[PDB]
Amino acid sequence: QISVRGLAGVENVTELKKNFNRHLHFTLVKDRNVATPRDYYFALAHTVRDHLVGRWIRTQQHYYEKDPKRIYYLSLEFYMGRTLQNTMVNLALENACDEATYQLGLDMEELEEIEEDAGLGNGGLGRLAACFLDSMATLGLAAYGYGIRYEFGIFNQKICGGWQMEEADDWLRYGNPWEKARPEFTLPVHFYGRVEHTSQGAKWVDTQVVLAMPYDTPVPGYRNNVVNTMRLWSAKAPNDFNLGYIQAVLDRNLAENISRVLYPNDNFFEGKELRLKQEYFVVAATLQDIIRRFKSSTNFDAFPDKVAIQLNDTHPSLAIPELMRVLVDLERLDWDKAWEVTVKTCAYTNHTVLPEALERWPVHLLETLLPRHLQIIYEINQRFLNRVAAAFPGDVDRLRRMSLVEEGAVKRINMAHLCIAGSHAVNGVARIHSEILKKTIFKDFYELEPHKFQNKTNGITPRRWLVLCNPGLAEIIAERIGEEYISDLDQLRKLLSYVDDEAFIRDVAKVKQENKLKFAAYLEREYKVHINPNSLFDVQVKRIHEYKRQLLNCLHVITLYNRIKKEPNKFVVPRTVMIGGKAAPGYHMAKMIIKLITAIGDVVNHDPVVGDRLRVIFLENYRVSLAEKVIPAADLSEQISTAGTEASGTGNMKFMLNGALTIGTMDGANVEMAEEAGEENFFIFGMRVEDVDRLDQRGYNAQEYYDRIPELRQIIEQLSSGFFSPKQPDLFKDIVNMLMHHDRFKVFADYEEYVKCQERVSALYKNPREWTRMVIRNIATSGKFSSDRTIAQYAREIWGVEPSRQRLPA
């Protein structure tokens, strides 16, 4: 059908069809008379999977022959989403498969909607890992993703009575055709026990053993025949476990619960034992696998030359003391040499500066669960502080500030401090975030070892986030500059020479209109909700959190509503305000924010005077597959976190690449995006980081804004009086109280400028031609935000390996 989707050759279509029927028969054991759409989806998935195996096997054989340096990306989250379409895109089988299923009398798009999302992540951090695996394979790096195969991923969100309800994400129910169990490579992981000091070295004994069973999933690069591996561990009890009889067998669940479910917290630390077990489980099994592969290439001096371990945040920070444990206790290396190897092998990536998100584990927990690791951590701390004391003689407070051990009610281990000490590189995820790390929370560490600190601005893969979700846009772009940009996004700059091209302007605007129509139809299909395709699509999708300020968006919405009710017969640009995202189960304020959003919709969407001029919809169960649908349909991207809180953000990049203009604060990557496109082509507003600091030094008093802004006051009074909750007048008392007395994120401080900026957005939307020209300038300068650029920088500046675009023989 379309160019970028590959060729539909006669031979290939014929071969796909026969293999499709073969799997339906032999694999699914069904016939065309009893087969259901799900059956057809699986027949197609297995057919596509077959094309991966040959490449998968030779890629791994290749790495064996050449023995390049291996990159191990450790993460407790991999937000993969669906795999079928992505695989077809990277293998250039999309048009062929579409034609083949068409000839078999089936609609491939219908079949793609049957695949469950692999929701093994919470949000940005997990999605970044997913985009990174794609870029590493596309850049020909010998990389391996290592994580946990959760039986239940992020919960499915249902909205009942306007409230979020959670339900188990049983994503493996019908089976996962993409994974391959490798029980032959099962490894043991130890817990509890005690430390015994003998003649030669310490020994960790009397431990409880839990088996780690690996499952491998292929990660295809973009049309280069490279297929890397993502290995996820599953917990299994040994057969002699707890071995009345019946109970012992039933108690096997205790050990296997380790890989049962993903903790649903976004930017928030919960110090539960089960979570600590998951963190060690992934680290212990992974390191054994790494060392095994290394030995099958004694001389650990070359370990750093053949291995690179990237820690996605502090979640897998135990890799540092675990590596030391193995080298010292098992391999018998002296401490100093072991430490040298560890530091040169590990690298740490920080993703946030929010205090409540940093991991600080209670010493009593580590003491009971991992006694040997606690001893190693103390030793690491002791030697680290000796170095600090020698560099800053007499600075006793610096010593207490930099310690890995925090004193107080309960002693805790600061995992971030542990990561900085044991890594040769520490990076932030956006220029401003990395600068904040050096000026604030890690200032002491930066002064001790300035060379360790770097920046690696985040990115997104243009395969899934452009070609896959927006083929219409990828096509009109390819028509003008070719297909090369898909693996070299910087080429989009060439589109700048078409900003005055009347044909292109029309095509860009047409693609957007088509996406909006398709999404508007979807909302009625699966959610039965009417919306005006002609209105401006104002969307904010991301996890619900106070720092992301969905509340500021709500205030604007209510303002628009009050203004209409004030001057009913006055013209206003029609808007469809869409807000979506999940709230962590135990985050009360976040759940109240979702309720407020639906409550506003209940009032606004049923007011006759408003008509189709303003709609407020809450997008239920926001996840990767839904993002691929709503982002291509958006006109306005809301990125309004309080300056200094959103480390980078990645959703912002997805919107920019797909034709949406951005309204946001100078926070995270927004700064670099505005810098690339030009501030005149971005809708910036609000306090800058320096302004927030000034306000804090002076003291933030929300009452002041309430007293001086009539429109704001009216909104707060509506909330308090029950205007949005008739039957429950004080339903939103907590929200008002927080906004008025303890708003850590200064919602009111940016209200005026936000509303003003939004007016400028509406003014531009009234001029179709100029709105589209600004969109073109955004798309044309989004090249820097490709994860291929990010990974190439990690490769050269941290891992010490050269990326490759060379194809492998198919």
Ligand X SMILES: Nc1ccn([C@@H]2O[C@H](CO)[C@@H](O)[C@H](O)[C@H]2O)c(=O)n1
Ligand Y SMILES: *Cc1c(COP(=O)(O)O)cnc(C)c1O
By annotation, the residues acting in catalysis are: 351, 542-543, 548, 650, 654
If one asks whether residue 668 binds ligand X (CB under 6 A), the answer comes out as: yes
Look at residues 727, 725, 735 and name the one whose alpha carbon lies nearest to residue 603: 725
State which of residues 53, 205, 410, 503 lies at the interface with a copy of itself (CB under 8 A). Answer: 53
If one asks whether residue 437 binds ligand X (CB under 6 A), the answer comes out as: no
Residue count at the site for ligand Y (CB under 6 A)? 12
352, interface contact from a copy of itself, ligand Y, ligand X, none, CB < 5-8 Å by kind: ligand X
3-state secondary structure 7-50: CCCHHHHHHHHHHHHHHHHHHCCCCCCCCCHHHHHHHHHHHHHH
State which of residues 135, 176, 267, 650 lies at the interface with ligand Y (CB under 6 A). Answer: 650
Q: Are 196 and 372 in contact (CB under 8 A)?
A: no
Rounded to a whole number of angstroms, the minimum distance from the CB of residue 589 to a copy of itself is 17
Going from the C-alpha of 98 to that of each of 42, 48, 110, 511, 622, the distances in angstroms are 15, 12, 11, 21, 27
Considering only residues 96 through 155, tell me which ones interact with ligand X, judged by CB under 6 A.
Answer: 123-125, 128
Nearer to ligand X, 77 or 635 (CB): 77
662 bridge partner residues: 637
Tell me: is residue 750 an annotated ligand-binding position: no
Considering only residues 231 through 260, tell me which ones interact with a copy of itself, judged by CB under 8 A.
Answer: 236-237, 239-241, 243-246, 249-250, 252-253, 257, 260
State which of residues 112, 166, 395, 444 lies at the interface with a copy of itself (CB under 8 A). Answer: 166
- Burial (0-12, 13-18, 19+ Cβ within 10 Å), 634: buried
If one asks whether residue 623 binds ligand Y (CB under 6 A), the answer comes out as: yes
Q: Which residue has the tokens 């003391």?
A: 321
If one asks whether residue 464 binds ligand Y (CB under 6 A), the answer comes out as: no
**Alpha helices, DSSP H only, in 67-168?**
84-91, 94-103, 108-112, 124-138
Rounded to a whole number of angstroms, the minimum distance from the CB of residue 327 to a copy of itself is 28
**Which of the stretches 48-56, 373-381, 592-600, 745-753 binds a copy of itself when contact is defined by CB under 8 A?**
48-56
Q: Which residue is nearest to ligand Y (CB)?
A: 651
316, interface contact from a copy of itself, ligand X, ligand Y, none, CB < 5-8 Å by kind: none
Q: What is the full DSSP assignment across 205-272? A: ESPEEEEEEEEEEEEE-SSS--EEEEEEEEEE--TTTT--HHHHHHTHHHHHGGGTB----SS-----
- Copy the structure tokens of residue 130: 């997913």
623, interface contact from ligand Y, ligand X, a copy of itself, none, CB < 5-8 Å by kind: ligand Y
Distance CA 342, CA 323 (A): 7
Residue count at the site for ligand X (CB under 6 A)? 18
Rounded to a whole number of angstroms, the minimum distance from the CB of residue 486 to ligand Y is 19
State which of residues 46, 49, 654, 784 lies at the interface with ligand Y (CB under 6 A). Answer: 654
Look at residues 290, 402, 406, 403 and name the one whose alpha carbon lies nearest to residue 342: 290
Q: Are 108 and 44 in contact (CB under 8 A)?
A: yes
Spell out, one character per residue from 104 to 123, where the chain touches ligand Y: x when CB under 6 A holds, - when not. -------------------x
Tell me: is residue 297 an annotated ligand-binding position: yes
Q: Please tell me whether residue 478 adopts helix, strand or coil conformation.
A: helix
Distance CA 365, CA 753 (A): 47
Nearer to a copy of itself, 260 or 494 (CB): 260
Distance CA 664, CA 210 (A): 47
651, interface contact from ligand Y, ligand X, a copy of itself, none, CB < 5-8 Å by kind: ligand Y
Nearer to ligand Y, 377 or 469 (CB): 469
Spell out, one character per residue from 235 to 274, where the chain touches ligand X: x when CB under 6 A holds, - when not. -------------------------------xx-------
For 670-692, b/e burial (b = at least 16 CB within 10 A) is: bbbbbebbeeebbbbbbbbbebb
- Copy the structure tokens of residue 633: 């349909």
For 439-454, b/e burial (b = at least 16 CB within 10 A) is: eeebebbbebeeebbb
Look at residues 637, 655, 628 and name the one whose alpha carbon lies nearest to residue 578: 637
If one asks whether residue 542 binds ligand Y (CB under 6 A), the answer comes out as: yes
542, interface contact from ligand X, a copy of itself, ligand Y, none, CB < 5-8 Å by kind: ligand Y
627, interface contact from a copy of itself, ligand X, ligand Y, none, CB < 5-8 Å by kind: ligand Y
Opening angle at CA 409, ends 403 and 413, nearest 5: 35
Rounded to a whole number of angstroms, the minimum distance from the CB of residue 14 to a copy of itself is 18
If one asks whether residue 82 binds ligand Y (CB under 6 A), the answer comes out as: no
State which of residues 129, 432, 627, 634 lies at the interface with ligand Y (CB under 6 A). Answer: 627
Distance CA 269, CA 414 (A): 12
If one asks whether residue 127 binds ligand Y (CB under 6 A), the answer comes out as: yes
User: For the CA atoms of the chain, what is the radius of gyration?
Assistant: 27
Rounded to a whole number of angstroms, the minimum distance from the CB of residue 648 to ligand X is 3
If one asks whether residue 640 binds ligand X (CB under 6 A), the answer comes out as: no
Rounded to a whole number of angstroms, the minimum distance from the CB of residue 735 to ligand X is 22
Spell out, one character per residue from 439 to 478, where the chain touches ligand X: x when CB under 6 A holds, - when not. -------------------x--------------------
If one asks whether residue 648 binds ligand X (CB under 6 A), the answer comes out as: yes
Regarding beta strands 575-580 and 536-541, do their DSSP bridges make them parallel or antiparallel, or are they unpaired? parallel
Regarding beta strands 425-428 and 70-74, do their DSSP bridges make them parallel or antiparallel, or are they unpaired? unpaired
Q: Are 284 and 319 in contact (CB under 8 A)?
A: no
Site residues, a copy of itself (CB under 8 A): 25-26, 29-31, 36, 38, 50, 53-54, 56-57, 61, 152, 155-156, 165-168, 170, 173-175, 180-181, 183-184, 236-237, 239-241, 243-246, 249-250, 252-253, 257, 260-261, 263-264, 272, 274, 585-586
Site residues, ligand Y (CB under 6 A): 123-124, 127, 542, 622-624, 627, 649-651, 654
Q: Which residues are documented as binding site for AMP?
A: 31, 64, 292-297
Q: Which residues are documented as binding site?
A: 31, 64, 292-297
